Amino acid sequence: QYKTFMGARVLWPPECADDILEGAIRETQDALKKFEIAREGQKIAEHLKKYMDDHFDPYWHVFFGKNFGCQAVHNKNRFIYFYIEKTAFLMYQTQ
């Protein structure tokens, strides 16, 4: 039912660790807000994955947009899926 969070709408119960979640939740709207706009494409997801690899575990994949969909295997308990203002964001880790 896409419960509300102080970032945005997130599907719950969460299938990602809380610290990793909070990192993603705060980094996305920070990185959007500061010196980034919706007109630019790849150079966002670039920065997002770099930020995750710097602090957290190394191998990440990020997919976001306005329409898509996937099935995928991933490491246990490392799935982030959230909307913000009608924009779907998805991220997951693989060994």
């Binding site: 119960p13 299938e15 494409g41 790849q42 670039e46 947009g65 295997v73 246990k76 308990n77």
Partner: protein
């Protein structure tokens, strides 16, 4: 309450290398465990004492009155493709 265990996954999968499919699993074990530690101490068990005391007995008696001649080094390695980072968009 019929407990559910937070910090547990919803399902488990593993590749089958004989029948090439996956096959998932949605019944997940729900016991919290932390600090499992494995032991190596063994008290007057039947099965272990004979098997160990007997090998050392035979060895020490035999030397009391070497056979396996010198070993040979070898090598083998698997083929490891490279990891690259390419990003493309449709926007």
């Amino acid at each position: 309450l019929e407990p559910k265990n937070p910090q547990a996954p919803k399902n488990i999968t593993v590749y089958d290398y004989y029948t090439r499919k996956f096959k998932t699993d949605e019944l997940v074990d729900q016991m919290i465990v932390h600090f499992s530690m494995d032991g190596d101490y063994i008290w007057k068990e039947s099965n272990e004492y004979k098997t160990q005391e007997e090998i050392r007995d035979t060895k020490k008696a035999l030397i009391k009155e070497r056979n396996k001649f010198n070993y040979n080094t070898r090598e083998c390695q698997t083929i490891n493709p490279s990891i690259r980072e390419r990003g493309v968009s449709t926007e």
